[PDB]
């Protein structure tokens, strides 16, 4: 498929299952 | 006066009813105002055009650190959590991110409090405090954030690429930062980080490098006055926009091969080509044209051939952002065991395909097909959620004129074959970079990346290899894509039926299938959502059957891929996956050709013929996938274990891979017919469709299964659902495990309450709303236990409760005590809060629960949630909120005293402790607020024994929904 930089956040808002 | 220019008409989609006004303030800030008289939540976002790429060489992570600090207080609002607390009490939320060239801040909130939120927000860019005390605490949050990425393969590769380019180029910088770079090293060098933060903010947070986007119910004129009043005061330093004309990869960085050792057992090949910045050619996107062709997955594609040879399973190609002045073009693929032995050949094929493009020359019909498709997509674009919408717009206001921001990255304009040839001319062997990731290189590397410790090796590619690639001739197997036949043409919105219902209606109720239907009555777009749940006990009967159900569906999607890719490009999508109760199938997109795709899928699953090669390859990838879970984060393991402990039936990863080896082609072929022989189908068809059409689709699915699979109705007594384990009053259990990859601890605390019900739901949700903000501010901001600190409700199998999740370097038992101390603080905080504050929370929850969906898929998901959980409470929000508004402060206190308090008579607690890699052992039980004394927990040593020794909750009763 077509490609469509890792960026850092202030918080993770949802905790998730994975 | 305070305004320098008011843009002309902002080109928008005709289906878009929101109002737009673009303008540029006298200080240079580019603004996009958005009025939506219906929005339940208003939102604002501001993007500063500078990022980690501008970090001082001796203070890595400074720009990211600045981003964190801006939330901890301003002169106008000193309280370090005044911002987050205000949003919390007004149904709002906020976050921000830092990239190489951008720092984006955004929030949303009840439409009634836009000004109050925006005021507090604007202060971030006017008078930040950068309080010394906050700085010393929050640095731990940054360190913890980096810590969780240290063992993440994606980040390791991300930083490794930077480390293999020009060391003098800012591209080589470490942008996350950590305690060493932000505290330890600076202190040693005699640097004052506080001053540096202020200096950085002062020098770069200039209005000329800022873009803002605000969305609310107010009119454009009122929004204009609001923005001017709060942002025109931002100072303009006329800062030059950072430019990076010299590409990070120079000659000495080309024709290089990198062999890398991954953490997870993954096999990948990364091919990179340095290219000029193509951003200014956005009107024709030559880079996306080449990506479209190179990354295509239809017949004749590079992927199809690489897969046929059994070398790769997936592929992504196209341009990759760099920064102002430089970009990359990539072709990445995963590798099969054989593919890893034929890397040179794979790359040769890559160049043969590229040579095919050169020989055929740029194809205008291809460009036109995409152009027309993008035009259709832009026109019928789903309405976006405010928060994400403003954040995105704030970012692109930096690259496109005010009038073009909405259409910019959507519509294609002119075909530029010359630019395409220009980029294509860069995709040659002499300027290629190759990286191979595989565990097979372990013990064979000689270099270590300083920031993550990545083990790897660098070698120059032999000239004879480069030369062979340069001589790549044409391969008869490679062809240009054929005309896409899935392009939608019928966009008529069928008129609302006279018997149309506001909620889904049961229009079919037989043993074979239960059909829920609702004709879209809000969005009026030529789209539909077709959701199907196929029930069968043979999908999860045991580990072996779970593996086969997965493998079966995975193999089916793999054989349908070439065919489905085209549909996907034409906005027609589908999802097929195995569940603990059977199979899940969802078709979404333009309703036009949905029937064709659906029929194909059902036909295929009922007449599927397995390909041995594909089977062995996918099975091998599945085995690693199961094993790779050991490399997941501590909090991920915690949630995983809790799930296994609390659910009646749940097969572990270990049980699944142990049974995998026994999955043989013959057994899989026998499995399919058995799986489809008996089923029950519960569906939800929602969108631009009529009752008769709905009944028509269902009949087709049934008929296809009956004709090819001889499928028959399942018995109602067979329609079994799993129960949640019922914990004993005053009980406390602890399950402990270790994470062998991450050197950090994780923990999840579960306080089971009771079965889901209107009253129980709102007791829990209101309490969660009340402690939400205080939990984050206490456990993270104040105590800095870790970057990841979470609290909230947990719902599973009709049961529910309160959950806390934390990832920290501190041991679980210490974490446990802290959460317990917090609970005592909250208690006190609730008993002392004013009715005013209490009611504010009730209203905050009310708005959150009543916030209406902006698009069909969001509305559908809610209905689907009610059908899947089998509660069918389609009018839940209205009911529950009505009940919510009657709760009093006293009710919440009692709820806490009887269910959650440390000495609560009905406390039901289980804790999952995930120890850090370097921890050999750890106890399960052990200024700062005072932590209460806890009982001796029962240590769970065997999950099976645990579940067996406890009773199981009953299943929730369905909210009767009478209909034909």
From Swiss-Prot, chain A:
The lineage of its organism: Eukaryota, Metazoa, Chordata, Craniata, Vertebrata. It comes from the Eukaryota. This is Insulin B chain.
Curated annotation (Swiss-Prot), chain B:
Its EC number is 3.4.24.56. ATP binds at residues 385, 851-857. The keyword Nucleotidyltransferase does not apply. Plays a role in the cellular breakdown of insulin, APP peptides, IAPP peptides, natriuretic peptides, glucagon, bradykinin, kallidin, and other peptides, and thereby plays a role in intercellular peptide signaling. Substrate binding induces important conformation changes, making it possible to bind and degrade larger substrates, such as insulin. Contributes to the regulation of peptide hormone signaling cascades and regulation of blood glucose homeostasis via its role in the degradation of insulin, glucagon and IAPP. (Microbial infection) The membrane-associated isoform acts as an entry receptor for varicella-zoster virus (VZV). Changing residue 784 to C: Increases catalytic rate towards INS and amyloid. The SlyX motif may be involved in the non-conventional secretion of the protein. It comes from Homo sapiens. Changing residue 855 to C: Increases catalytic rate towards INS and amyloid. Its cofactor is Zn(2+). Changing residue 787 to F: No effect on catalytic activity. A motif (SlyX motif) lies at residues 809-814. Changing residue 382 to C: Increases catalytic rate towards INS and amyloid. GO terms for biological process: amyloid-beta clearance; amyloid-beta clearance by cellular catabolic process; amyloid-beta metabolic process; antigen processing and presentation of endogenous peptide antigen via MHC class I; bradykinin catabolic process; hormone catabolic process; insulin catabolic process; insulin metabolic process. Pfam families: Peptidase_M16, Peptidase_M16_C, Peptidase_M16_M, PqqF-like_C_4. The lineage of its organism: Eukaryota, Metazoa, Chordata, Craniata, Vertebrata. Belongs to the peptidase M16 family. This is Insulin-degrading enzyme. Substrate binds at residues 292-298, 315-319.
């Amino acid at each position: 498929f077509v490609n469509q930089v890792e960026a850092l956040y202030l918080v993770c808002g949802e905790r998730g299952f994975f | 006066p305070a305004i320098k220019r008011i843009g002309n008409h902002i080109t928008k989609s005709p289906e878009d009813k929101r109002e737009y006004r673009g303008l540029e303030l006298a200080n240079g800030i580019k603004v996009l105002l958005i009025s939506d008289p219906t929005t339940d939540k208003s939102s604002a976002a501001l993007d500063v055009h500078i990022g980690s790429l501008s970090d001082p060489p001796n203070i890595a992570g400074l720009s990211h650190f600045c981003q964190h600090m801006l939330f901890l207080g301003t002169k106008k609002y000193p309280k370090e959590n005044e911002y987050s607390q205000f949003l919390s009490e007004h149904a709002g939320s906020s976050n921000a991110f830092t990239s190489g060239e951008h720092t984006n801040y955004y929030f949303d909130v009840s439409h009634e409090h836009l000004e109050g939120a925006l005021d507090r927000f604007a202060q971030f860019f006017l008078c930040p405090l950068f309080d010394e005390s906050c700085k010393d605490r929050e640095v731990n949050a940054v360190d913890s954030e980096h810590e969780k990425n240290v063992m993440n393969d994606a980040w390791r590769l991300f930083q490794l690429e930077k480390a293999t380019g020009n060391p003098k180029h800012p591209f080589s910088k470490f942008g996350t930062g950590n305690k060493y770079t932000l505290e330890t090293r600076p202190n040693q060098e005699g640097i004052d980080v506080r001053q540096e933060l202020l200096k950085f903010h002062s020098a770069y947070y200039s209005s000329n490098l800022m873009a803002v986007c605000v969305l609310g119910r107010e009119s454009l004129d009122d929004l204009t006055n609001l923005v001017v009043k709060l942002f025109s005061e931002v100072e303009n330093k006329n800062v030059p926009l950072p430019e990076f004309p010299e590409h990070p990869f120079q000659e000495e960085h080309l024709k290089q091969l990198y062999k890398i050792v991954p953490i997870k057992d993954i096999r990948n090949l990364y091919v990179t080509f340095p290219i000029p910045d193509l951003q200014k050619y956005y009107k024709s996107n030559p880079g996306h044209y080449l990506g479209h062709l190179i990354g295509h997955e239809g017949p004749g594609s590079l992927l199809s051939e690489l897969k046929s040879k059994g070398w790769v399973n997936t592929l992504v190609g196209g341009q990759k952002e760099g920064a102002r002045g430089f970009m990359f073009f990539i072709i990445n693929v995963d590798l099969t065991e054989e593919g890893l032995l034929h890397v040179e050949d794979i790359i040769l094929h890559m160049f043969q395909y590229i040579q095919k493009l050169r020989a055929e020359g740029p194809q205008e019909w291809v460009f036109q097909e995409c152009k027309d498709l993008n035009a259709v997509a832009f026109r019928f674009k789903d309405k976006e959620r405010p928060r994400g919408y403003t954040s995105k717009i704030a970012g692109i206001l930096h690259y496109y004129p005010l009038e073009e921001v909405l259409t910019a990255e959507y519509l294609l304009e002119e075909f530029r074959p010359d630019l395409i040839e220009m980029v294509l001319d860069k995709l040659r062997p002499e300027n290629v970079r190759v990286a191979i990731v595989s565990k097979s290189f372990e013990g064979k590397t000689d270099r270590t990346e300083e920031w993550y410790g990545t083990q790897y090796k660098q070698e120059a590619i032999p000239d004879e290899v480069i030369k062979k690639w340069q001589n790549a001739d044409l391969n008869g197997k490679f062809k240009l894509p054929t005309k896409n036949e899935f392009i939608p043409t019928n966009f008529e919105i069928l008129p609302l039926e006279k018997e149309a219902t506001p909620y889904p209606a049961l229009i079919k109720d037989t043993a074979m299938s239960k059909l829920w239907f609702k004709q879209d009555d809000k969005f009026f777009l030529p789209k539909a959502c077709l959701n199907f749940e196929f029930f069968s006990p043979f999908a999860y009967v045991d580990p072996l059957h779970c593996n086969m159900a997965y493998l079966y569906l995975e193999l089916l999607k793999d054989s349908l891929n070439e065919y489905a890719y085209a549909a996907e490009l034409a906005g027609l999508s589908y999802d097929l996956q195995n569940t603990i109760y059977g199979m899940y199938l969802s078709v979404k997109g333009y309703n036009d050709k949905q029937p064709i795709l659906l029929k194909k899928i059902i036909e295929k699953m009922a007449t599927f013929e397995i390909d041995e090669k594909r089977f062995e390859i996918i099975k091998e990838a599945y085995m690693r996938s199961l094993n790779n879970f050991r490399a997941e984060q501590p909090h991920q393991h915690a949630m995983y274990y809790l799930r296994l402990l609390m659910t009646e039936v749940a097969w572990t990863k270990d049980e699944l891979k142990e049974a995998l080896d026994d999955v043989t082609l013959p057994r899989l072929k026998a499995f399919i017919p058995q799986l489809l022989s008996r089923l029950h189908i519960e569906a939800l068809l929602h969108g631009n469709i009529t009752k008769q059409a709905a009944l028509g689709i269902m009949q087709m699915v049934e008929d296809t299964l009956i004709e090819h699979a001889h499928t028959k109705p399942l018995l109602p007594s067979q329609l079994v659902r799993y129960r949640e384990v019922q914990l004993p009053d005053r009980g406390w259990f602890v399950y402990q495990q270790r994470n062998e990859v991450h050197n950090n601890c994780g923990i999840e605390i579960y306080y089971q309450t009771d079965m889901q019900s209107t009253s129980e739901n709102m007791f829990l949700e209101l309490f969660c709303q009340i402690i939400s903000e205080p939990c984050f501010n206490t456990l993270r901001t104040k105590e800095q236990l870790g970057y990841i600190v979470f609290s909230g409700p947990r719902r599973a199998n009709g049961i529910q409760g309160l959950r806390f999740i934390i990832q920290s370097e501190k041991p679980p038992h210490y974490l446990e005590s802290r959460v317990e101390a917090f609970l005592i603080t909250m208690e006190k905080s609730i008993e002392d809060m004013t009715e005013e504050a209490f009611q504010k929370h009730i209203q905050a929850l009310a708005i959150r629960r009543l916030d209406k969906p902006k698009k069909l898929s969001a509305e559908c998901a809610k209905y689907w949630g009610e059908i899947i959980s089998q509660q069918y409470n389609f009018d839940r929000d209205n009911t529950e909120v009505a009940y919510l508004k009657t709760l009093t402060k006293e009710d919440i206190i009692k709820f806490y005293k009887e269910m959650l308090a440390v000495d609560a008579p009905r406390r039901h607690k289980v804790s999952v402790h995930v120890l850090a890699r370097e921890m050999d052992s750890c106890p399960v039980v052990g200024n700062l607020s005072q932590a209460p004394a806890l009982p001796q927990p029962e240590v769970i040593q065997n999950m099976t024994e645990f579940k067996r020794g406890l009773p199981l909750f009953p299943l929730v009763k369905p909210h009767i929904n009478f209909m034909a």
